[PDB]
Amino acid sequence: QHCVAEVLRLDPQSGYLKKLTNATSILYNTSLNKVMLKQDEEVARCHICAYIASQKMNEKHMPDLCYPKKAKHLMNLFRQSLSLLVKKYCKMTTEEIIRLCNDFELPREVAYKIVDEYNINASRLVCPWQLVCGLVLNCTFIVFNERRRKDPRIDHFIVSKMCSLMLTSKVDDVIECVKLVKELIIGEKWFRDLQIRYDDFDGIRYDEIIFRKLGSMLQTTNILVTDDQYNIWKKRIEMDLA
Amino acid sequence: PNVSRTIARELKSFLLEYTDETGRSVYGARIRTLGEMNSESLEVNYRHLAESKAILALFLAKCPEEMLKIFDLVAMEATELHYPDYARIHSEIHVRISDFPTIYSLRELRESNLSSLVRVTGVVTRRTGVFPQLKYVKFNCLKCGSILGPFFQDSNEEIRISFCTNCKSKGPFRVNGEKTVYRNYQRVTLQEAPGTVPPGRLPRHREVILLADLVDVSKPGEEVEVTGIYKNNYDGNLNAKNGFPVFATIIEANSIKRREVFSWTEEEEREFRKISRDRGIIDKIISSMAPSIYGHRDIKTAVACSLFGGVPKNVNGKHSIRGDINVLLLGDPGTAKSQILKYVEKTAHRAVFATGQGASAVGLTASVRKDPITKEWTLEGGALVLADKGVCLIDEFDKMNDQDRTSIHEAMEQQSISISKAGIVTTLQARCSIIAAANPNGGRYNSTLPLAQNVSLTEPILSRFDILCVVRDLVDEEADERLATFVVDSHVSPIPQELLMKYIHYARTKIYPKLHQMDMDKVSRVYADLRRESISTGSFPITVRHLESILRIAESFAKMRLSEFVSSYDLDRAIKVVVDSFVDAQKVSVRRQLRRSFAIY
Amino acid sequence: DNTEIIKSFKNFILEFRLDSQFIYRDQLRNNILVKNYSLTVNMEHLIGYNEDIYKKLSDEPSDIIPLFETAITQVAKRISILSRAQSANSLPTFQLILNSNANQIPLRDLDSEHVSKIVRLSGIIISTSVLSSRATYLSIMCRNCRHTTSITINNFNTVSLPRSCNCGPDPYIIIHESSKFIDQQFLKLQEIPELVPVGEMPRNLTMTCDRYLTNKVIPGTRVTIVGIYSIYNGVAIRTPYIKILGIQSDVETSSIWNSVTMFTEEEEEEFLQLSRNPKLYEILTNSIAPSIFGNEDIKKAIVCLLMGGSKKILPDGMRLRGDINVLLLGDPGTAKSQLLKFVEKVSPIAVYTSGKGSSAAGLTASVQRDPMTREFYLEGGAMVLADGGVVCIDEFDKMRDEDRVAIHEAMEQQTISIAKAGITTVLNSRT
Ligand SMILES: Nc1ncnc2c1ncn2[C@@H]1O[C@H](COP(=O)(O)OP(=O)(O)O)[C@@H](O)[C@H]1O
Ligand SMILES: Nc1ncnc2c1ncn2[C@@H]1O[C@H](COP(=O)(O)OP(=O)(O)O)[C@@H](O)[C@H]1O
Ligand SMILES: [Zn+2]
Ligand SMILES: [Zn+2]
């Protein structure tokens, strides 16, 4: 039942969940009662089980359910028993770029946004590797400012990652990949919502920069260090005896 | 059949609204007790859902190992509405059954009966292992450094995978024992009851598997009732079948018992103290010790002192004293010598009936022994070893060689064994109570000689015996009149023995009653008295060994009465015992000691 | 995350203290002078300091342990350089050691639950099999590419060699002379024979250990241990075993001739107060048998005896027996048995017997052979167990003649000899 609920709640990755666990139960039951249905490794035995249980209740969905040789076999058997940017004009899918975005373990909402961007504005293109590259980079720089604000060892590792995920030794093209999308995507309300959420504004806060730029000297350029820093740095030399 | 819909709703109806008498939902108690208990199992009486509807039992009988599928999940259902997060903790539930009327032997099994409910009788012997095997599986892959998800395992096969979620690669696979989850598996032997193997025939035997966290609920020598199922075993390597192609058969059994843990409650000890303190239990002790034979009271009394054990002490961890009591009986075999000791084995706590060679449990020593299973070297000890707190019985003490005698000598000497063999060196605690018997040379005792002169025993272990009791031919008419009447009526006040062992179990725990130096220099007096009176007409002496023993008897009777400390007018009993012990142990010359040493009576 | 736990752990190293004195900090500072690369630990000391590691080390220990190992090595690396800067390249992982006393659970009450967790227990020892080795760091060259690489392993003394770096499968030789290894052994256990059912033989269990948790133990030594109920490989089944992570022995059970010889200093001063009293002899006579009466003259010999005498050697080899020989003689009572019971207690490393040899006890060397390889080994002896000690006997009367002879030779030269078929012995009694 644990494994049943596991594989059944593996579909997302009201009446649905209930009726589907009941379905898989009595389905597996019917399939194992008689002596007719054998040599079926339990390795895989809760999948077109789940697909036909989708087919049964009320509404069914061909996509995102089967997601192979024996998949067809067992189906019939049960059903009877009952570089990257020089490349010109490439093509992509939903899950291709879900992969290239989920490699950073970023959320799926940002990915859906880049997907919407694409399927509306993937029309007039030369190469979508550039656009989606720049997109997910300017997702990373905006959401990952904290860890980077304290760890400048990150910005080399990250750019190195996407330099070789798309197979180049030259990188200034990637720099352009970022600034051009930033020129493009600059002013949409959803981009706006993300900037108020994760608070980069060029990577710097609002309540600081406005005094940086309106015309002030109270502007806190933190050359000096904060108090808790020293409060914890002192422990390193406390035990200096050893 | 896809009638799991009707079947499930109606069996859960049964499970929930069951009412039999006073509108009693008996199984609500079961499940709530289960959840209270972190329990993994639950029982369901077959007789009542069988009373209501028996095609329950039919769709069971066609494939009962598939009748399971609804019931285990239904247990979780009832469980979580009364115990959320139980399904979190206990991954799965097993069930148990009771009260099935059909009977088969271990031989009566026919092909028409298998793959159905089976109920047998027999005995559990040769218990092997509580080994673990799998129920949930995950992996360590090589082409990727990652895992598999969770997977339940069938009742009849291993598992192996060639697909991977990253690619269709049949890379090297290995299970992650360092993370997986397991359950309890036993292989058990089971044999028929020899009390009913009919004339001439032999008893067949079978093999049994025990699961569901019910392992080690059995021990060798128990009558058992496994109800279960039955089937073959396609265990591979089968194409090498000569003769006809015919296969073994094995039970999977669910329910289990032992019929066909002693301890004290508040009132159980309340009554103990009530009776212990009220007016001299001990007459009723010897009235209720062992009614096997009418026999005689004196040696019963001696061994009653041998029962309880006294108190040991050390003078700040030196000059130890033995608290536990010894005995030695002897006399003609015509009377009951090998009866009451086995009774005591039946009546004590952590007693033993060992023996010499022939019809013995063990050889009364310890040794580097093999084992039939897998050559497990082990260190068994003589039954002396087992009851280092308790007692060790023996019969036919005489019938022993050099070393099996030296061992018991060592025991009653320094209460510890030593071993110097086999890459192993050690001593133990042998502070056991000794009992024994033997056979005199010539049947009769040879009244006209002393002890060591009559029986060919040696003294140095003989000295440890505070008691050496003897009888002989009892020749008068009344002997016949009583013993023949009893032994024929065998085929024509005293308290339960359960209470008596529960009393000793209550006694060796609590009471270490003391002795007050109030008038004890009478010890010094009467000792010096009779130690001179001994030379006055006797040959051998009496020695402080006896005195120490009388003190141990005094504290013995203190534990018996359960009083707080020594009483004065029971030292009379102790010393009278040792007195009339030395009386019968000697020549007819002692017949003057009969008159001399009675004033101490 | 894991580094949060690492710091919660490493603060316990140098920021723990009780009785106003650092404990483990200077313990390490000592251990490193010892060149030990390990420590000792209590886990009772961690419960009050911090609860962020206990409830998770419990149920996922192996997930947490090598972390502690690496933390330890981290602390080592600073303090190594700092102490080199103070006074006066290759620093492997340090085996951790620990113990506990929370409880003891027996083999009988186990089940197939709480598996891979940690458990506490009692038992008795048998095995001293062999120093079986494992690897820790071993270099690899390919036979065709000549492509050097390297591997190191950590705990499990999971993966194998690389299947491909054409060279084909199995392209790799293992170099030894620049490889590294460690030792373990296979150690058994079995329960208290006094706490068992009346009927059946007992159940034992194996275990494994490593570098400095090795060779601590010799059989008969009752010991308590804590470990992890691990697994390796009827229908489908894996063998239950255990991984050690804590051993504790009684300090010295059955008397070891390799005993202590370097006593403390505080005791010297009272020792020499007792050296310089004139009442020395009379006190010893008042106290060797305090619950015992008379026979002052008899008690006045034992002190002549236990201290031995003139070990005197001469340039031929005809030594003189440094000790003395004695014989009580008399009746029941008269304390002839009680002193003898006592003397082992006062004794440091001596032995007691009855006559004829006792149960499973050779009164002299009862030699036999090996259960494995059927080879010769000097086994035992009540006269050589106690080398450099006294021996206590009762019932000297009923000897066997063969038993009496060698003992009859000891008391004037104290050296047994056995020259049976293949083995030729001169084993020193000195008792
Ligand atoms: N007083 C008695 N009442 C009933 N049965 C007796 C009595 N005395 C002896 N017997 C029977 O005779 C047997 C005597 O056996 P025992 O002398 O103990 O054999 P052994 O001497 O070999 O131990 C007992 O088993 C018992 O059943
Ligand atoms: N000289 C003595 N003084 C006091 N108590 C003794 C003396 N001799 C023996 N006992 C006591 O009498 C008991 C008998 O022991 P012991 O006489 O040593 O054995 P045995 O009688 O076999 O030689 C012991 O419990 C001991 O404490
Ligand atoms: Zn793979
Ligand atoms: Zn190669």
PDB file of N, CA, C and O in Angstrom, chain B residues 40 127 131-133 143 178 183-184 187 216 371 376 388 402 409-410 413 418-423 426 429 460 543, chain C residues 112-113 156 163 194 200-201 203-204 219-220 234 236-238 333 352 354 358-360 377 379 394-395 398 400:
ATOM      1  N   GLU B  40       1.888  -5.600  15.006  1.00  0.00           N
ATOM      2  CA  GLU B  40       2.015  -5.884  13.584  1.00  0.00           C
ATOM      3  C   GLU B  40       0.977  -6.877  13.101  1.00  0.00           C
ATOM      4  O   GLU B  40       0.934  -7.181  11.897  1.00  0.00           O
ATOM      5  N   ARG B 127      14.518 -26.104  16.127  1.00  0.00           N
ATOM      6  CA  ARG B 127      14.374 -24.689  15.799  1.00  0.00           C
ATOM      7  C   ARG B 127      15.680 -24.112  15.275  1.00  0.00           C
ATOM      8  O   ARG B 127      16.726 -24.260  15.906  1.00  0.00           O
ATOM      9  N   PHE B 131      16.242 -15.832  10.835  1.00  0.00           N
ATOM     10  CA  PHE B 131      16.979 -15.104   9.821  1.00  0.00           C
ATOM     11  C   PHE B 131      16.193 -13.972   9.191  1.00  0.00           C
ATOM     12  O   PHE B 131      14.957 -13.962   9.232  1.00  0.00           O
ATOM     13  N   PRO B 132      16.863 -12.975   8.687  1.00  0.00           N
ATOM     14  CA  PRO B 132      16.149 -11.906   8.015  1.00  0.00           C
ATOM     15  C   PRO B 132      16.077 -12.088   6.518  1.00  0.00           C
ATOM     16  O   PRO B 132      17.029 -12.586   5.910  1.00  0.00           O
ATOM     17  N   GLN B 133      14.966 -11.688   5.907  1.00  0.00           N
ATOM     18  CA  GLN B 133      14.904 -11.619   4.450  1.00  0.00           C
ATOM     19  C   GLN B 133      14.083 -10.393   4.081  1.00  0.00           C
ATOM     20  O   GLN B 133      13.627  -9.645   4.941  1.00  0.00           O
ATOM     21  N   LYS B 143      26.651   2.435 -13.612  1.00  0.00           N
ATOM     22  CA  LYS B 143      26.659   3.406 -14.704  1.00  0.00           C
ATOM     23  C   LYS B 143      26.125   4.755 -14.268  1.00  0.00           C
ATOM     24  O   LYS B 143      26.465   5.779 -14.866  1.00  0.00           O
ATOM     25  N   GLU B 178      22.732  -1.722   3.224  1.00  0.00           N
ATOM     26  CA  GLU B 178      23.005  -0.662   4.162  1.00  0.00           C
ATOM     27  C   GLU B 178      21.840   0.321   4.261  1.00  0.00           C
ATOM     28  O   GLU B 178      21.920   1.260   5.059  1.00  0.00           O
ATOM     29  N   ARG B 183      12.370  -8.378   7.089  1.00  0.00           N
ATOM     30  CA  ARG B 183      11.389  -9.027   7.941  1.00  0.00           C
ATOM     31  C   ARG B 183      11.966 -10.350   8.442  1.00  0.00           C
ATOM     32  O   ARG B 183      13.068 -10.763   8.060  1.00  0.00           O
ATOM     33  N   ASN B 184      11.143 -11.057   9.214  1.00  0.00           N
ATOM     34  CA  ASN B 184      11.518 -12.234   9.979  1.00  0.00           C
ATOM     35  C   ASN B 184      11.147 -13.530   9.276  1.00  0.00           C
ATOM     36  O   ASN B 184       9.976 -13.730   8.949  1.00  0.00           O
ATOM     37  N   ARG B 187      12.768 -21.267   9.333  1.00  0.00           N
ATOM     38  CA  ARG B 187      12.606 -22.651   8.891  1.00  0.00           C
ATOM     39  C   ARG B 187      12.527 -23.549  10.113  1.00  0.00           C
ATOM     40  O   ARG B 187      13.431 -23.543  10.950  1.00  0.00           O
ATOM     41  N   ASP B 216      10.426 -17.311  17.357  1.00  0.00           N
ATOM     42  CA  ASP B 216      10.778 -17.617  18.747  1.00  0.00           C
ATOM     43  C   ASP B 216       9.592 -17.437  19.681  1.00  0.00           C
ATOM     44  O   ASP B 216       9.705 -16.858  20.761  1.00  0.00           O
ATOM     45  N   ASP B 371      28.171 -28.474  16.669  1.00  0.00           N
ATOM     46  CA  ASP B 371      26.735 -28.408  16.558  1.00  0.00           C
ATOM     47  C   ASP B 371      26.345 -29.032  15.238  1.00  0.00           C
ATOM     48  O   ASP B 371      27.135 -29.019  14.290  1.00  0.00           O
ATOM     49  N   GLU B 376      28.747 -25.019  14.607  1.00  0.00           N
ATOM     50  CA  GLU B 376      28.833 -23.935  15.572  1.00  0.00           C
ATOM     51  C   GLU B 376      29.485 -24.463  16.845  1.00  0.00           C
ATOM     52  O   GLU B 376      28.840 -25.138  17.648  1.00  0.00           O
ATOM     53  N   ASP B 388      23.315 -22.119  38.667  1.00  0.00           N
ATOM     54  CA  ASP B 388      24.277 -21.466  39.542  1.00  0.00           C
ATOM     55  C   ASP B 388      23.596 -20.706  40.662  1.00  0.00           C
ATOM     56  O   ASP B 388      24.136 -20.609  41.767  1.00  0.00           O
ATOM     57  N   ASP B 402      36.657 -41.030  36.614  1.00  0.00           N
ATOM     58  CA  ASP B 402      37.536 -40.079  37.282  1.00  0.00           C
ATOM     59  C   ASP B 402      37.025 -38.645  37.173  1.00  0.00           C
ATOM     60  O   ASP B 402      36.675 -38.003  38.176  1.00  0.00           O
ATOM     61  N   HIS B 409      33.218 -32.564  42.659  1.00  0.00           N
ATOM     62  CA  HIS B 409      34.096 -32.214  43.767  1.00  0.00           C
ATOM     63  C   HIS B 409      34.465 -30.744  43.720  1.00  0.00           C
ATOM     64  O   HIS B 409      34.307 -30.016  44.707  1.00  0.00           O
ATOM     65  N   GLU B 410      34.947 -30.296  42.565  1.00  0.00           N
ATOM     66  CA  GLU B 410      35.300 -28.898  42.375  1.00  0.00           C
ATOM     67  C   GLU B 410      34.125 -27.995  42.666  1.00  0.00           C
ATOM     68  O   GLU B 410      34.280 -26.917  43.255  1.00  0.00           O
ATOM     69  N   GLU B 413      33.400 -27.672  46.236  1.00  0.00           N
ATOM     70  CA  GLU B 413      34.567 -27.123  46.912  1.00  0.00           C
ATOM     71  C   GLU B 413      34.648 -25.614  46.764  1.00  0.00           C
ATOM     72  O   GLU B 413      34.471 -24.885  47.743  1.00  0.00           O
ATOM     73  N   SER B 418      36.937 -24.655  36.129  1.00  0.00           N
ATOM     74  CA  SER B 418      37.989 -24.138  35.283  1.00  0.00           C
ATOM     75  C   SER B 418      38.114 -24.994  34.037  1.00  0.00           C
ATOM     76  O   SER B 418      37.733 -26.161  34.043  1.00  0.00           O
ATOM     77  N   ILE B 419      38.580 -24.387  32.942  1.00  0.00           N
ATOM     78  CA  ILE B 419      38.864 -25.131  31.714  1.00  0.00           C
ATOM     79  C   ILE B 419      40.219 -24.716  31.173  1.00  0.00           C
ATOM     80  O   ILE B 419      40.558 -23.529  31.170  1.00  0.00           O
ATOM     81  N   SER B 420      40.979 -25.693  30.690  1.00  0.00           N
ATOM     82  CA  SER B 420      42.311 -25.484  30.144  1.00  0.00           C
ATOM     83  C   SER B 420      42.489 -26.208  28.814  1.00  0.00           C
ATOM     84  O   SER B 420      43.516 -26.835  28.559  1.00  0.00           O
ATOM     85  N   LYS B 421      41.505 -26.096  27.930  1.00  0.00           N
ATOM     86  CA  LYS B 421      41.517 -26.787  26.646  1.00  0.00           C
ATOM     87  C   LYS B 421      41.183 -25.845  25.505  1.00  0.00           C
ATOM     88  O   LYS B 421      40.544 -24.820  25.709  1.00  0.00           O
ATOM     89  N   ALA B 422      41.657 -26.178  24.302  1.00  0.00           N
ATOM     90  CA  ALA B 422      41.014 -25.740  23.068  1.00  0.00           C
ATOM     91  C   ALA B 422      41.149 -24.235  22.801  1.00  0.00           C
ATOM     92  O   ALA B 422      40.263 -23.636  22.192  1.00  0.00           O
ATOM     93  N   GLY B 423      42.232 -23.599  23.233  1.00  0.00           N
ATOM     94  CA  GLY B 423      42.416 -22.163  23.014  1.00  0.00           C
ATOM     95  C   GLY B 423      41.426 -21.293  23.747  1.00  0.00           C
ATOM     96  O   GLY B 423      40.973 -20.275  23.214  1.00  0.00           O
ATOM     97  N   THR B 426      39.005 -20.301  31.370  1.00  0.00           N
ATOM     98  CA  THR B 426      37.845 -19.649  31.955  1.00  0.00           C
ATOM     99  C   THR B 426      37.475 -20.311  33.265  1.00  0.00           C
ATOM    100  O   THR B 426      37.720 -21.507  33.455  1.00  0.00           O
ATOM    101  N   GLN B 429      30.563 -19.342  37.608  1.00  0.00           N
ATOM    102  CA  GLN B 429      29.912 -19.412  38.906  1.00  0.00           C
ATOM    103  C   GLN B 429      29.075 -20.738  39.008  1.00  0.00           C
ATOM    104  O   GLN B 429      28.051 -20.880  38.338  1.00  0.00           O
ATOM    105  N   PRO B 460      36.335 -36.888  50.627  1.00  0.00           N
ATOM    106  CA  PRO B 460      36.543 -35.433  50.559  1.00  0.00           C
ATOM    107  C   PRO B 460      35.399 -34.654  49.958  1.00  0.00           C
ATOM    108  O   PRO B 460      35.179 -33.500  50.343  1.00  0.00           O
ATOM    109  N   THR B 543      32.471 -31.990  63.645  1.00  0.00           N
ATOM    110  CA  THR B 543      33.340 -30.862  63.371  1.00  0.00           C
ATOM    111  C   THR B 543      32.534 -29.666  62.883  1.00  0.00           C
ATOM    112  O   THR B 543      31.391 -29.778  62.434  1.00  0.00           O
TER     113      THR B 543
ATOM    114  N   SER C 112      14.138  -8.979  13.599  1.00  0.00           N
ATOM    115  CA  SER C 112      14.567  -8.392  12.349  1.00  0.00           C
ATOM    116  C   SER C 112      14.149  -6.925  12.250  1.00  0.00           C
ATOM    117  O   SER C 112      14.203  -6.347  11.161  1.00  0.00           O
ATOM    118  N   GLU C 113      13.688  -6.330  13.353  1.00  0.00           N
ATOM    119  CA  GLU C 113      13.537  -4.892  13.481  1.00  0.00           C
ATOM    120  C   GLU C 113      14.816  -4.280  14.032  1.00  0.00           C
ATOM    121  O   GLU C 113      15.755  -4.977  14.420  1.00  0.00           O
ATOM    122  N   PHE C 156      34.478   0.181   4.892  1.00  0.00           N
ATOM    123  CA  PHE C 156      33.758  -1.076   4.737  1.00  0.00           C
ATOM    124  C   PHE C 156      34.722  -2.250   4.745  1.00  0.00           C
ATOM    125  O   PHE C 156      34.543  -3.258   4.054  1.00  0.00           O
ATOM    126  N   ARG C 163      35.538  -0.392 -14.984  1.00  0.00           N
ATOM    127  CA  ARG C 163      35.267  -1.343 -16.047  1.00  0.00           C
ATOM    128  C   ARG C 163      35.867  -0.897 -17.370  1.00  0.00           C
ATOM    129  O   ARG C 163      36.063  -1.732 -18.259  1.00  0.00           O
ATOM    130  N   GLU C 194      24.361 -19.309  31.813  1.00  0.00           N
ATOM    131  CA  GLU C 194      23.494 -19.375  32.980  1.00  0.00           C
ATOM    132  C   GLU C 194      22.126 -18.771  32.723  1.00  0.00           C
ATOM    133  O   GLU C 194      21.200 -19.031  33.498  1.00  0.00           O
ATOM    134  N   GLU C 200      18.249 -26.213  24.872  1.00  0.00           N
ATOM    135  CA  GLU C 200      18.934 -26.231  23.587  1.00  0.00           C
ATOM    136  C   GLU C 200      20.350 -25.702  23.669  1.00  0.00           C
ATOM    137  O   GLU C 200      20.734 -24.989  24.595  1.00  0.00           O
ATOM    138  N   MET C 201      21.114 -26.040  22.640  1.00  0.00           N
ATOM    139  CA  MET C 201      22.418 -25.463  22.468  1.00  0.00           C
ATOM    140  C   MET C 201      22.288 -23.958  22.239  1.00  0.00           C
ATOM    141  O   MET C 201      21.210 -23.464  21.911  1.00  0.00           O
ATOM    142  N   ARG C 203      23.238 -19.963  20.698  1.00  0.00           N
ATOM    143  CA  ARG C 203      23.385 -19.269  19.424  1.00  0.00           C
ATOM    144  C   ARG C 203      24.487 -18.238  19.527  1.00  0.00           C
ATOM    145  O   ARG C 203      24.520 -17.462  20.484  1.00  0.00           O
ATOM    146  N   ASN C 204      25.348 -18.204  18.522  1.00  0.00           N
ATOM    147  CA  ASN C 204      26.484 -17.307  18.482  1.00  0.00           C
ATOM    148  C   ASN C 204      26.325 -16.317  17.347  1.00  0.00           C
ATOM    149  O   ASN C 204      25.393 -16.404  16.553  1.00  0.00           O
ATOM    150  N   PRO C 219      39.918 -15.014  24.464  1.00  0.00           N
ATOM    151  CA  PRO C 219      38.660 -15.626  24.867  1.00  0.00           C
ATOM    152  C   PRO C 219      38.505 -15.834  26.356  1.00  0.00           C
ATOM    153  O   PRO C 219      39.446 -15.722  27.139  1.00  0.00           O
ATOM    154  N   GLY C 220      37.255 -16.075  26.731  1.00  0.00           N
ATOM    155  CA  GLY C 220      36.849 -16.198  28.110  1.00  0.00           C
ATOM    156  C   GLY C 220      36.548 -14.851  28.724  1.00  0.00           C
ATOM    157  O   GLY C 220      35.747 -14.750  29.655  1.00  0.00           O
ATOM    158  N   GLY C 234      17.294 -20.428   2.545  1.00  0.00           N
ATOM    159  CA  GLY C 234      16.049 -20.806   1.917  1.00  0.00           C
ATOM    160  C   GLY C 234      15.798 -20.144   0.581  1.00  0.00           C
ATOM    161  O   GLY C 234      16.624 -20.229  -0.331  1.00  0.00           O
ATOM    162  N   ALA C 236      15.159 -16.755  -0.418  1.00  0.00           N
ATOM    163  CA  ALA C 236      15.886 -15.531  -0.717  1.00  0.00           C
ATOM    164  C   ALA C 236      16.224 -14.854   0.599  1.00  0.00           C
ATOM    165  O   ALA C 236      15.315 -14.408   1.296  1.00  0.00           O
ATOM    166  N   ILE C 237      17.504 -14.743   0.943  1.00  0.00           N
ATOM    167  CA  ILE C 237      17.862 -14.501   2.331  1.00  0.00           C
ATOM    168  C   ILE C 237      19.290 -14.015   2.377  1.00  0.00           C
ATOM    169  O   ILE C 237      20.114 -14.370   1.542  1.00  0.00           O
ATOM    170  N   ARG C 238      19.565 -13.184   3.364  1.00  0.00           N
ATOM    171  CA  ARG C 238      20.872 -12.612   3.614  1.00  0.00           C
ATOM    172  C   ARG C 238      21.257 -12.897   5.054  1.00  0.00           C
ATOM    173  O   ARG C 238      20.405 -12.932   5.940  1.00  0.00           O
ATOM    174  N   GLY C 333      37.682 -29.765  60.003  1.00  0.00           N
ATOM    175  CA  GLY C 333      37.865 -28.517  60.703  1.00  0.00           C
ATOM    176  C   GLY C 333      39.272 -28.030  60.468  1.00  0.00           C
ATOM    177  O   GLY C 333      39.845 -28.202  59.388  1.00  0.00           O
ATOM    178  N   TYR C 352      44.271 -22.211  41.507  1.00  0.00           N
ATOM    179  CA  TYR C 352      43.729 -23.241  42.383  1.00  0.00           C
ATOM    180  C   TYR C 352      43.237 -24.457  41.622  1.00  0.00           C
ATOM    181  O   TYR C 352      42.677 -24.325  40.534  1.00  0.00           O
ATOM    182  N   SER C 354      41.727 -28.825  42.408  1.00  0.00           N
ATOM    183  CA  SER C 354      41.617 -30.055  43.176  1.00  0.00           C
ATOM    184  C   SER C 354      42.664 -31.030  42.646  1.00  0.00           C
ATOM    185  O   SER C 354      43.575 -30.648  41.908  1.00  0.00           O
ATOM    186  N   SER C 358      41.215 -31.100  37.491  1.00  0.00           N
ATOM    187  CA  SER C 358      39.810 -30.803  37.683  1.00  0.00           C
ATOM    188  C   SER C 358      39.122 -30.899  36.341  1.00  0.00           C
ATOM    189  O   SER C 358      39.749 -31.199  35.323  1.00  0.00           O
ATOM    190  N   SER C 359      37.816 -30.642  36.348  1.00  0.00           N
ATOM    191  CA  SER C 359      37.003 -30.767  35.154  1.00  0.00           C
ATOM    192  C   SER C 359      37.605 -29.958  34.033  1.00  0.00           C
ATOM    193  O   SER C 359      37.724 -28.741  34.130  1.00  0.00           O
ATOM    194  N   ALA C 360      38.042 -30.650  32.997  1.00  0.00           N
ATOM    195  CA  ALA C 360      38.648 -30.017  31.850  1.00  0.00           C
ATOM    196  C   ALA C 360      39.929 -29.282  32.208  1.00  0.00           C
ATOM    197  O   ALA C 360      40.228 -28.228  31.644  1.00  0.00           O
ATOM    198  N   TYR C 377      49.856 -27.930  19.252  1.00  0.00           N
ATOM    199  CA  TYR C 377      49.949 -26.743  20.083  1.00  0.00           C
ATOM    200  C   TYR C 377      49.941 -27.086  21.557  1.00  0.00           C
ATOM    201  O   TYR C 377      49.084 -27.841  22.022  1.00  0.00           O
ATOM    202  N   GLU C 379      48.773 -26.618  24.925  1.00  0.00           N
ATOM    203  CA  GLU C 379      47.443 -26.128  25.234  1.00  0.00           C
ATOM    204  C   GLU C 379      47.392 -25.425  26.571  1.00  0.00           C
ATOM    205  O   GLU C 379      47.112 -24.227  26.652  1.00  0.00           O
ATOM    206  N   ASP C 394      43.858 -29.164  47.026  1.00  0.00           N
ATOM    207  CA  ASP C 394      43.247 -30.009  48.032  1.00  0.00           C
ATOM    208  C   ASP C 394      43.158 -31.436  47.502  1.00  0.00           C
ATOM    209  O   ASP C 394      43.234 -31.676  46.296  1.00  0.00           O
ATOM    210  N   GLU C 395      43.012 -32.381  48.426  1.00  0.00           N
ATOM    211  CA  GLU C 395      42.995 -33.821  48.148  1.00  0.00           C
ATOM    212  C   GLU C 395      44.197 -34.263  47.317  1.00  0.00           C
ATOM    213  O   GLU C 395      44.084 -34.834  46.239  1.00  0.00           O
ATOM    214  N   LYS C 398      44.605 -38.692  46.475  1.00  0.00           N
ATOM    215  CA  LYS C 398      44.248 -39.453  45.277  1.00  0.00           C
ATOM    216  C   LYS C 398      44.790 -38.828  43.998  1.00  0.00           C
ATOM    217  O   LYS C 398      44.065 -38.304  43.154  1.00  0.00           O
ATOM    218  N   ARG C 400      46.932 -39.579  40.395  1.00  0.00           N
ATOM    219  CA  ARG C 400      47.224 -40.625  39.425  1.00  0.00           C
ATOM    220  C   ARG C 400      48.812 -40.627  39.450  1.00  0.00           C
ATOM    221  O   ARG C 400      49.445 -39.584  39.687  1.00  0.00           O
TER     222      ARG C 400
END
